[PDB]
Design a protein around this ligand. Structure first.
Ligand SMILES: Cc1cc2nc3c(=O)[nH]c(=O)nc-3n(C[C@H](O)[C@H](O)[C@H](O)COP(=O)(O)OP(=O)(O)OC[C@H]3O[C@@H](n4cnc5c(N)ncnc54)[C@H](O)[C@@H]3O)c2cc1C
Ligand SMILES: Cc1cc2nc3c(=O)[nH]c(=O)nc-3n(C[C@H](O)[C@H](O)[C@H](O)COP(=O)(O)OP(=O)(O)OC[C@H]3O[C@@H](n4cnc5c(N)ncnc54)[C@H](O)[C@@H]3O)c2cc1C
Ligand SMILES: Cc1cc2nc3c(=O)[nH]c(=O)nc-3n(C[C@H](O)[C@H](O)[C@H](O)COP(=O)(O)OP(=O)(O)OC[C@H]3O[C@@H](n4cnc5c(N)ncnc54)[C@H](O)[C@@H]3O)c2cc1C
Ligand SMILES: Cc1cc2nc3c(=O)[nH]c(=O)nc-3n(C[C@H](O)[C@H](O)[C@H](O)COP(=O)(O)OP(=O)(O)OC[C@H]3O[C@@H](n4cnc5c(N)ncnc54)[C@H](O)[C@@H]3O)c2cc1C
Lengths: 385, 385, 385, 385
């Protein structure tokens, strides 16, 4: 039957993650937002505490944690700073592909190292000309003997300048009329390969401590052994990846939303206007309630999507609903949080305007709001067949 | 660990409720909505199938089902018609108080005869002058020997003119300065008692086959033996009743919402405009997506609240979220379904306009939309103490 | 410069319309909703008072009022009952086409008679297979000498069974690849022409006193002299019509919205809960304010669209915005009105649930909500060219 | 009669403001937002072009423009940058009080020198302890001979560290039981007066080039000659100021919204995904439509409010609607513009993220979003009496 009870092991990860977020992230998060330095020390910690690369199988020195587990950890982390957290998350983004489409040699090689040093990796799909339209990418992969020559340009790559290796999706079928299901190939590319031209750190509105970059690939030679499953299987790998990664990204949005709520509640229970506490103005108490409603709903949705994949079933439909819902109410709570703070809310000396800046990517990265509806509509309708 | 998996026992109640709802209710729901006629045959049948009085403990010949089961069943019945379903629901509204505040003697007699015949019962609290403000009821109860004398009027009573007996909440402490927590008493009043004047059948916008009435109590004598826990324990019984009742009303709502979604989808996959199916217009596909999203979110909310109470914990916070959210989306979906149908949707020969009329009570009865935010806010703030 | 001041003449129409609506419609509107009788006596009055066929030029015994004028009158009428008002409005719907695409003989003939007796007319575009997609209609118009044989079926025709004559749009170019701009013809069809098979009165959710019917056309012979501008000019006539008619339909939605507000305010300033007036609960006062905000915005929008066409310029963009906005907030106010009324709001003895039933067609008829966005998007984008 | 036509004089101010805004502001607004630097050159230029201090009566060398003109101009400037524009706006905030409650002597000296040089002024009311609750300010004024002694602190003062003089609202009646209507006094305080301690430049989320500061008054001596109408007429002057000030702040909002709409449209007509322009995806076309709708609605609202005050009537109701609606849509549009841009939108090298940061104050400053509903509700109910 139904059960919304965490396991003992889960409660302990959660506690560990919560302590780290509230005692180590939070007190330093504000400064990193202002400076935009890579939160190296935070990451070195996360790793040591085992709150990084959680999906890596035990056979490669990993913890081999499930999707439910990661979601649980994520939410706690995100609560502190999604700038920091997204960096951690990007590691999982590049790992999953290898986990579901790599061989022992590949995994042992590239996943193994992650388990030894606090190294970082990244996930290169997006190009200047195509983000949402994956089948629209043009990074070319040309076979030349026992090597593949990669020529293309990637954009908005998280951990782009700090990564040891990249998952890279490239078009390997020059036939313009080739199906998406056969036109692409997934590769593992070591960042120190000649032809790899890492661009400047991009300056964005939010999650400013995160490393986001543009990377150019000029005659990058990749050993055939670096092909994940085989030529043409890149699209399958990419899609399969989302089932596992989408629920955790939703969780991160919930942690943000939860942060916003906590802060707004604290303040509403302190500040006075017209002789009453903010929380005593029915207008405000109603706002807070609607805020609370949404957090709980969003949390439920990722849980549902996570349990599903952990149960070994395609969770596309549920996963897409969570990401979509979590992303929208992270944005609504952020702006409502700034609102209860009044004048102080718009000021850089309070923790909420940052929340408002951060939350916005959730509606864009890893499947925009619109794309999510496309997917839900397809999965929904598909059921009437 | 998390689980969203139904038991094998749950799977068959669900199948029983689903077969009855779509093979018996559906085919006649429209004719009942038009006439307003009490659906005795369906109720009769519902009783035989064991889809009524579902919470009655086994000792009293009941099934002794939990809140989760109720919700499961409820949602299927609701799918068919909320007009019919609320009749069923009313019975449970009347029973819970007894089950949580009645002695063995009271339960055996009053719960026991529900199990023997297809009887109905009602819950009498609301008055012409007070609905939301429960602490504002005025139907007085005066202790006269080994009996109580009831004087008052009750309005908007489901199964009002069809009940064998009523749970009746009356003010037993004439001091207007008496704490709500001590001023009321719960009673089991038999409908045939001299002095009960059953009003006319009220004509409402929706749920038209449901019997809703005003009732007047003129020097109604009730044996002190019919007092639930004792004099002054009225409020506690009423408030405690919602913990178990809230989830199931929420399920009815996402039942009527599931109906809305289904119909809308079916039509969208049939109707053509501008040379394409409705579903093929991104504007519609997006609508359907949002609709889908909401149903799923609502479902999860009343599960979360149901599990909680079944776990033997006060679920007020969760139950409020669920009732509030499900009621809202039920209303948005019903209007969007009519929308997808265009001109046919506004027509009485199609199944969605009825849905639109029906869905509105969810935002009113069993704690209005506003009232819910009060509860939520109150419960949420509590957590910051 | 700017001016939001009515003229003396306008103030007087407005007063006349307001008195009629509040003193004659209102007190009888409830009964007509229940019975669904055609409000003949109300219409005979409207005519006599000159609140009907206001756009008919003076040369044909009309008042030759502008679009601003009609909007002003409409809003007042609608306030009383949109069931009644829509009947009046349907007259204008069938007249405009003749006004912008007919000749003297035609006008003098068909408009003239309207000015003599309290006759009714209608507007037949919609078919079972096409409403939104005007270019998708299939009512065929075949030239045979000095006559045209009409074979087709129309649906949802307002005044359908009470009309003296119909504006009828038919496809006159059998070439399936003919442009919409040349494939259709507009005709004037006397209702008593053999082949005209008027269907049953349709039963809809709202505006139930309105006559809505299905009409079949079997070998209906129409004199060539009944062609409005000429063969192929039907599409131009249809489109041109909207510029003039859309603002008045928006106005009618505002009158409904305004009615809802008035009623909700009255009640909120009467009813007490928790020791305070409903209007004293910040939660409610905020609801009412948002309600008021929307009415004023919607009123502004139709005014803008009306002034534009009266100024002799295509007002498509503004007109489409008004209809769209007015329609949505008529629906929001209706449901919010039922909400403040609580339990009584869902009851047939109060004036708001009807408002909720009526308001729904505004999002469907005369350009659905979605179609409106299509038009706005086209007109908006067009400006970036 | 209605008119939405600008005068020939209005057309040229509009052209002047439009040329300056998009040829001078736009090209440098981004660099000012990054640095936070006060845009003296633009202000200087704005003064020369006569787009500043626009309400100053001609007698004092001003233009003597109405509220409508202000709005017209405001909206164009705002389009360019609200950071720059609020600096301009602040001046007017400081001037109005003087213009409606000052004697000839006061006006000549203080308004007069604004016309001679490019000076700035500020409006000081808000305090660290009270912003929304004006009747809760505590900066005291003690009459000491033919002078007043000011003691208090003011927070969030636009042009705080750049003002020649301030309008300052202080409590002149120590009785805490004194009616708000009689407890305050308005003052013109020169910035160079011994005792004024100008705080640091506050760092906010948006409008970063705008000078916002906290100010402390320590035994500041103000000649009784600097008292506006008299002791106790403070509240009346402040409240009366919003009637004229509300509309223009609303215009700034629909200025920043117009910018959002333009950019979004431009990109949608350039970017391709799934083989089509963004604008060609009904999901986007619909978004743009809604965006368009809102800008137009907001525009009409502050026109309606502007006309009203120019007509010599209290516009509180209308001005509140406008400020409230425009502030909201400004926020929705800014987020939707970032949305249309995808990943580029979140990037600092594109013009919309800034818009998103900027737009938020509209829901806070000059009567929060909540405060506005209070005013509206109060004004609306008044009409039912
Ligand atoms: C901070 C940041 C970090 C990122 N990190 C990574 C990373 O680590 N790895 C990586 O590969 N990528 C990353 N991304 C990129 C991300 O995957 C894309 O930004 C996102 O998928 C959107 O694609 P786009 O930016 O090309 O927008 P576009 O695809 O150009 O879309 C523009 C807008 O149109 C909408 N749209 C597009 N097509 C349709 C359609 N058919 N119907 C309706 N609406 C449509 C979109 O929803 C969007 O709002 C990152 C982006 C950002 C901003
Ligand atoms: C950039 C900037 C520039 C400014 N410029 C000026 C200036 O030039 N001159 C000046 O005098 N002021 C200025 N202000 C201040 C501004 O007017 C106030 O911030 C605004 O009035 C809100 O007050 P507050 O900050 O005290 O928030 P609070 O009043 O503390 O309100 C906090 C929150 O509670 C809500 N709230 C408060 N009371 C109620 C209630 N009764 N019912 C319901 N909700 C309620 C508010 O809506 C808000 O959401 C500026 C502020 C900013 C940020
Ligand atoms: C009470 C009533 C009175 C009426 N009176 C008249 C009258 O007097 N004369 C007359 O000619 N007609 C009349 N109509 C009909 C009216 O014009 C149509 O009902 C309306 O245009 C909708 O068309 P439809 O009903 O065919 O719905 P459909 O066109 O089938 O559309 C179904 C749904 O899909 C949406 N949709 C369709 N195409 C698209 C698209 N390309 N993109 C996105 N969404 C889309 C629509 O918005 C709608 O919600 C009346 C209708 C009603 C209900
Ligand atoms: C079809 C139907 C069946 C019903 N069945 C039963 C039944 O079986 N047993 C039973 O006991 N009752 C029953 N009820 C009554 C129902 O529970 C009440 O209608 C509901 O509690 C609302 O109360 P009210 O009608 O008195 O509205 P009111 O309490 O008068 O409220 C009016 C409006 O003001 C709002 N409001 C009230 N107080 C506040 C506040 N403090 N702050 C903000 N907003 C506020 C409400 O949300 C509502 O919008 C039924 C009602 C209906 C319509």
């Amino acid at each position: 039957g139904f059960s919304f009870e965490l396991t003992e092991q889960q409660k302990e990860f959660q506690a560990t993650a919560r302590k780290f977020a509230r005692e180590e992230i939070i007190p330093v998060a504000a400064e990193y937002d202002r400076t935009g330095e890579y939160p190296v020390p935070l990451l070195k910690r996360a790793w040591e505490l085992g709150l990084m690369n959680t999906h890596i199988p035990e056979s490669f020195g990993g913890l081999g944690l499930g999707i439910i587990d990661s979601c649980l950890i994520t939410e706690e982390l995100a609560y502190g700073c999604t700038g920091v957290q997204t960096a951690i998350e990007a590691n999982t983004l590049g790992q999953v592909p290898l986990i579901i489409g790599g061989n022992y040699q590949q995994q042992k090689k590239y996943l193994g190292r992650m388990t030894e040093e606090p190294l970082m990796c990244a996930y290169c799909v997006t190009e200047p000309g195509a983000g949402s339209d994956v089948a629209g990418i043009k990074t070319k992969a040309e076979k030349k003997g026992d090597e593949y020559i990669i020529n293309g340009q990637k954009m908005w790559i998280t951990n782009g300048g700090k990564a040891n290796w990249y998952f890279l999706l490239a078009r390997s079928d020059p036939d313009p009329k080739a199906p998406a299901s056969k036109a692409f190939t997934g590769f593992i590319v070591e960042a120190d390969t000649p032809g790899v031209q890492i661009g400047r750190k991009e300056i964005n509105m939010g999650q400013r401590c995160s490393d986001t970059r543009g990377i150019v690939f000029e005659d990058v030679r990749v050993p055939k052994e670096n092909v994940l499953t085989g030529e043409g299987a890149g699209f399958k790998i990419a899609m399969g990846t989302f089932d596992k990664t989408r629920p955790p990204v939703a969780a991160g949005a919930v942690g943000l939303a939860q942060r916003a709520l906590d802060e707004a509640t604290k303040y509403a229970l302190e500040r006075k206007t017209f002789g009453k506490l903010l929380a005593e103005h029915q207008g405000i108490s109603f706002l807070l309630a609607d805020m609370a409603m949404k957090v709980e709903l969003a949390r439920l949705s990722y849980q549902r999507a996570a349990w599903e994949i952990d149960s070994g079933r395609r969770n596309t439909y549920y996963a897409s609903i969570a990401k979509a819902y979590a992303a929208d109410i992270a944005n609504q709570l952020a702006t409502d949080a700034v609102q209860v703070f009044g004048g102080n809310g718009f000021n850089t000396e309070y923790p909420v305007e940052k929340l408002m800046r951060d939350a916005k990517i959730y509606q864009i990265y890893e499947g925009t709001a619109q794309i999510q509806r496309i997917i839900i509509a397809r999965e929904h309708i598909g059921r009437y067949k």
